């Protein structure tokens, strides 16, 4: 109890203080055989985190490590398998019984205590994004069973306060995914969560629409920019996993982008998010059309939308801010792939009107960005910026393979940048072999 408390406290210390475990998941996984009993004392963990001291209080860094360790243990108990990259899969009857009981214990426990945890740590973006990894492991049927509706309300309350207080893509994304999980995985509670969700969306769609109108009718206050950006981030975040097409967000994202192109002066992060939000609106318009039985005008309306947006992402390659150029680029390669001829596969040849072959102008510009932003002359940030330029190349690589761009003009650029490997590589290879 206070014994298990000492062990968990020293465990958080050994993790933080040694460089002997870099990943919490890996430490937990390694101690799992020997210390499963300790590592699932979740009452002890939430107590440490929620109670005030008498004494010796936890530091902010230890609080954070304890949450990350707690969530790793919740995953291991619920999944009953090592974490990704310690895998090698069949459970014994006793492991299956322990998995069921463990899921039951953590579900009953964290349904009650996750609201209290979110409440206390509501400001700390890292901690909240960690704490919201938890409900994905819930046995959601218990929200009915244990007459625990009071605690579902409690969570939705605290998710609302979190979404309202924050703009970090991590946090917003954890809220978005957590609403997804609560909704479409149990009918009893679906109806209640849908209401809390759509109410939350309405409040943000109002704030966004009022902020857009402020910004555009204006010379523009720093408040006008914060208001648009902050509300748009929430809606973009959610628009990935929630179909928000009933709110015409595309229209206002389009105006934000059309204004910034025209008067040249839209803040980079408003352009980037407006781009992402518009893209997510289109993907969702497309899903509703594939699955429905769409009329001729239904298709031709989505066509006009996609053409004006391809045109916006085209013009956005010429914006000064490289984050914009990269977003515009990534969406161009996505969209030109999606609205290729592939679309007409699976007897779906009704969709011909939605196909788009990029013109030469666009292919040339999708060639330039590669030359300018994938192939550049010149710690942690640089291995992250490399994998991104890899994604940007791979994304572009797909348009080459299917001849959506000039597949020859592209290979020439690959010759030009590989030259020093085809001219001196053999000599460099054998030399480095013998050292
Ligand atoms: C939102 C936004 C889009 C594009 C630009 C770039 N600007 C317009 C394209 S251009 O070549 O006509 C002159 C440069 C700026 C802002």
Residue pair 386/429 in contact (Cβ under 8 Å)? The answer is: no
Would you say 138 and 193 are in contact if contact means Cβ atoms under 8 Å apart?
A: no
Contacts of residue 43, defined as CB under 8 A and 6 or more positions apart, other chains included, come to 109
**For residue 145, what are the CA distances in angstroms to 43, 148, 177, 178?**
21, 7, 23, 20
Q: Which one, of 215, 62, 203, 193, lies nearest residue 127 by Cα?
A: 62
Report the nearest-CA residue for atom 5 of ligand 1: 319
Pocket test residue of 315, 320, 324 for ligand 1, highest count of atoms within 8 A of CB: 315
User: Which phi and psi angles does 19 have, rounded to 5°?
Assistant: -100, 20
Q: Which of 96, 78, 227, 230 is nearest to 163 (CA)?
A: 230
Torsion on CA atoms 110, 115, 120, 126, rounded to nearest 10: 70
Contacts of residue 349, Cβ cutoff 8 Å, sequence gap at least 6: none
Q: What are the C-alpha distances in Å from 291 to residues 32, 176, 395?
A: 45, 24, 26
266 lines ligand 1 (CB under 6 A): yes
- 318, 331, 362: residue to mutate for ligand 1 pocket, most atoms within 8 A of CB: 318
What's the CA-to-centroid distance between 233 and ligand 1, angstroms?
A: 22
The two tokens of residue 125 are 């973006």
> How far is CA 43 from each of CA 50, 72, 107, 414, rounded to the nearest angstrom?
10, 15, 12, 58
Degrees to nearest 5, angle at CA 51 with 46 and 52: 145
Tell how far the Cα of 400 is from the centroid of ligand 1, in angstroms: 26
CB-CB contact of 179 with 238 (8 Å): yes
Q: State the residue for tokens 């699955």.
A: 291
How many angstroms does the Cα of residue 318 sit away from the middle of ligand 1? Answer: 6
Distance CA 275, CA 232 (A): 11
* Coil, strand or helix at 354: helix
- Which residues in the chain have their C atom more than 2.5 Å from the N of the next written residue, marking a break after them? 54, 88, 218, 378
Q: How many whole angstroms separate alpha carbon 155 and alpha carbon 161?
A: 10
Asked whether 151 and 193 are in contact (CB, 8 A), the reply is no
Q: Tokens 């857009």 belong to which residue?
A: 212
Find the helix packing angle between 187-217 and 149-165, rounded to 10°.
Answer: 20
147-163 CB burial, b ≥16 within 10 A, e <16: ebeebbebbbebbbebb
Residue bearing tokens 């940048």: 417
CA–CA dist 196, 207 (Å, integer): 17
First to last CA, the chain: 58
Provide the 3-class DSSP secondary structure of residue 347: coil
Residues in the chain: 435
Closest CA to 339 of 361, 354, 359, 358: 354
Instruction: Answer whether 46 contacts ligand 1 (Cβ < 6 A).
Output: no
List the structure tokens of 187.
Answer: 């009918």
Tokens of 388: 């991104």
Spacing, Cα 315 to ligand 1 middle (Å): 6
Q: Which two tokens stand for residue 59?
A: 């530091």
**Widest CA span in the chain:** 74
Q: Residue 315: CB within 6 Å of ligand 1?
A: yes
Ligand 1 atom with the smallest distance to the CA of 320 is 6
**CA distances, 122 to each of 59, 65, 119, 307, 406 (Å):** 17, 16, 5, 42, 51
Q: Which of 220, 225, 229, 261 to mutate to test the pocket of ligand 1 (most atoms within 8 A of CB)?
A: 261
Indicate which atom in ligand 1 lies nearest the CA of residue 262.
8
Q: How much distance in Å is there from the Cα of 329 to the middle of ligand 1?
A: 14
**19, two tokens:** 């460089």
Q: Is the CB of 162 under 6 A from ligand 1?
A: no
Say what the resolution is, in angstroms. 2.9
Cα 183 to Cα 176: distance, rounded to the nearest angstrom: 11
Helix axes 93-120, 60-79, angle to 10 degrees: 150
Q: Is ligand 1 within 6 A of the CB of residue 271?
A: yes
Pocket of ligand 1 contains residue 264 by CB under 6 Å: yes
User: What sign for the dihedral angle of Cα 163, 168, 169, 171?
Assistant: negative
* Atom number of ligand 1 nearest to Cα 257: 1
């Amino acid at each position: 109890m206070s014994p298990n408390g000492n062990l968990i406290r020293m465990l958080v210390l050994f993790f933080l203080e040694s460089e002997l475990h870099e990943h919490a998941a890996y430490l937990v996984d390694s101690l799992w055989e020997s210390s499963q009993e300790l590592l699932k004392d979740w009452e002890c963990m939430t107590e440490l985190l929620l109670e005030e001291p008498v004494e010796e209080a936890m530091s902010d860094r230890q609080e954070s490590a304890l949450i990350e360790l707690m969530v790793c243990t919740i995953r291991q108990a619920a999944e009953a398998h090592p974490p990704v990259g310690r895998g090698t899969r069949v459970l014994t009857a006793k492991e299956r019984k322990t998995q069921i009981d463990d899921r039951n214990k953590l579900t009953e426990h964290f349904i009650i205590t996750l609201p209290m945890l979110l409440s206390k740590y509501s400001a700390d973006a890292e901690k909240v994004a960690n704490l919201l990894q938890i409900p994905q492991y819930f046995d959601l049927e218990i929200y009915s069973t244990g007459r625990m509706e009071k605690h579902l309300d409690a969570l939705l309350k605290q998710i609302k306060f979190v979404v309202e207080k924050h703009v970090e893509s991590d946090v917003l994304e954890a809220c978005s995914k957590t609403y997804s999980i609560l909704c479409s995985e149990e009918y009893t509670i679906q109806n209640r969560v849908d209401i809390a969700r759509s109410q939350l969306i309405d409040e943000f769609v109002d704030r966004f629409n009022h902020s857009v109108e402020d910004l555009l009718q204006e010379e523009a206050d720093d408040d006008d920019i914060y208001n648009v950006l902050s509300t748009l981030k929430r809606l973009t975040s959610f628009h990935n996993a929630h179909d928000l097409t009933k709110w015409d967000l595309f229209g206002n994202c389009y105006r934000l982008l059309k204004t910034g192109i025209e008067h040249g002066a839209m803040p980079e992060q408003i352009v980037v998010q407006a781009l992402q939000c518009s893209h997510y609106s289109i993907l969702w318009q497309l899903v509703k059309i594939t699955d429905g039985s769409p009329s001729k005008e239904d298709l031709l309306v989505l066509r006009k939308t996609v053409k004006s947006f391809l045109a916006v992402c085209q013009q956005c390659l010429s914006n000064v801010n490289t984050p914009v150029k990269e977003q515009a680029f990534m969406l161009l390669c996505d969209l030109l792939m999606i609205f290729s001829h592939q679309l007409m596969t699976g007897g779906r040849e009704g969709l011909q009107p939605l196909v788009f072959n990029p013109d030469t102008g666009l292919q040339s510009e999708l060639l330039s960005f590669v030359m300018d932003h994938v192939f550049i002359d010149q710690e942690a940030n640089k291995i992250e910026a490399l994998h991104k330029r890899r994604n940007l190349l791979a994304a572009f690589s797909k348009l080459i393979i299917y001849d959506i761009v000039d597949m020859h003009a592209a290979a020439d650029i690959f010759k030009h940048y590989m030259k020093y490997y085809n001219d001196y590589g053999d000599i460099i290879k054998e030399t480095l072999s013998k050292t």
